[PDB]
Structure formats: C-alpha cells, structure tokens
Design an enzyme around this catalytic site. Structure first.
Site, mmCIF file in Angstrom:
data_model
loop_
_atom_site.group_PDB
_atom_site.id
_atom_site.type_symbol
_atom_site.label_atom_id
_atom_site.label_comp_id
_atom_site.label_asym_id
_atom_site.label_seq_id
_atom_site.Cartn_x
_atom_site.Cartn_y
_atom_site.Cartn_z
ATOM 1 C CD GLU A 213 -13.971 10.823 -3.777
ATOM 2 O OE1 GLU A 213 -12.747 10.805 -3.503
ATOM 3 O OE2 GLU A 213 -14.859 11.002 -2.924
ATOM 4 C CG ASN B 211 -7.221 7.670 3.257
ATOM 5 O OD1 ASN B 211 -7.459 8.651 2.545
ATOM 6 N ND2 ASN B 211 -7.675 6.454 2.982
ATOM 7 C CG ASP C 169 -6.683 5.384 8.206
ATOM 8 O OD1 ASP C 169 -6.132 5.501 7.089
ATOM 9 O OD2 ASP C 169 -7.802 4.850 8.342
ATOM 10 C CB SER D 122 -6.347 3.298 4.679
ATOM 11 O OG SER D 122 -6.985 4.550 4.869
ATOM 12 C CG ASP E 282 -9.180 6.986 -0.299
ATOM 13 O OD1 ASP E 282 -9.311 6.035 0.495
ATOM 14 O OD2 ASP E 282 -9.653 8.125 -0.082
ATOM 15 C CG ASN F 263 -10.080 3.971 2.844
ATOM 16 O OD1 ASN F 263 -8.941 3.521 2.913
ATOM 17 N ND2 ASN F 263 -10.568 4.818 3.740
#
Ligand SMILES: [Cl-]
Ligand SMILES: [Cl-]
Ligand SMILES: [Cl-]
Ligand SMILES: [Cl-]
Ligand code: NA
EC number: 3.2.1.17
Length: 129
Positions: A35, A46, A48, A50, A52, A59
């Site tokens: 990650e 991301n 959309d 958002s 992380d 998220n």
C-alpha cells in the site's frame, strides 16, 4: 517516516494488530509494504476525488476527514492528516475498524492482489518479535 520492515512489524504488534480479526502480523506488514512501501506520508488520489492516506492507504471516502471529499464519511473520526504521522497509532486504530466491517482485509486491494494466499510470514521472518 519510512519504517523498516521489522520496525513496522514490532510497532503493529505493540498496537495489537497481530492476529487482529484473525489476520497474522505478516498479512499486515505485507499490506503496508504494497500500500505505502512502509512510508507513513504516502498519499494517493482516487478517481472519485477521495484520497488514500498513510501506511495502510486509508480512504477519505469513508474513514477520515480531509475536507475535500464532498459527501464522504469519517467513520474513524479523525483528520486524514493524522494517518500520515510517524506514530502509527491512528492508522492502526482505524485499520481495526476497517478490517472489522465485514470484508476483512479485502478492504485493501493491494493486500488482495499481492498478499492474500502468499507466504505472508516471510514479511516478519528474521525479526525479533
Ligand atoms: Cl505471519
Ligand atoms: Cl470532506
Ligand atoms: Cl509507531
Ligand atoms: Cl476475515
Ligand atoms: Na471523509
């Protein structure tokens, strides 16, 4: 902060993540490896809108507030910046909620694609734990 592998294993163990929800420590170290490459300051946007955050790429769509994910939730009740700290406490506490939501560690796509079903114990091999 960029953790060493055994350093992160020890910190995760101290914070009660080893065997949490049935997931051995190597699963958590492997998840963090893919990650974030063990970097607490990792961030990734991301599609959309958002973002992380942190060593486990938590998220803002659901788990933390960053003020720039309109319509999102803050289920860990924390600013997303708290997930970037050199101290992993906030990330661990939030990860415990995530892994308890019904999907286990499948919440981390990198875990599912790169750790699940592999020899995850290799990630803690050689460490004094
Ligand atoms: Cl393990
Ligand atoms: Cl927001
Ligand atoms: Cl820590
Ligand atoms: Cl599970
Ligand atoms: Na949010």
């Amino acid at each position: 902060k960029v953790f060493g592998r055994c350093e992160l294993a020890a910190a995760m163990k101290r914070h009660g993540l080893d065997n949490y929800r049935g997931y051995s420590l190597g699963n958590w170290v492997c998840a963090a490896k893919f990650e974030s490459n063990f970097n607490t300051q990792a961030t990734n946007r991301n599609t959309d809108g958002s973002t992380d955050y942190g060593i486990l790429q938590i998220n803002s769509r659901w788990w933390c507030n960053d003020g720039r994910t309109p319509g999102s939730r803050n289920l860990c009740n924390i600013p997303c910046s708290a997930l970037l700290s050199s101290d992993i406490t906030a990330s661990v506490n939030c990860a415990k909620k995530i892994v308890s939501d019904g999907n286990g560690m499948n919440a981390w796509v990198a875990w599912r694609n790169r750790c699940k079903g592999t020899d995850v114990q290799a990630w803690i091999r050689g460490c004094r734990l």
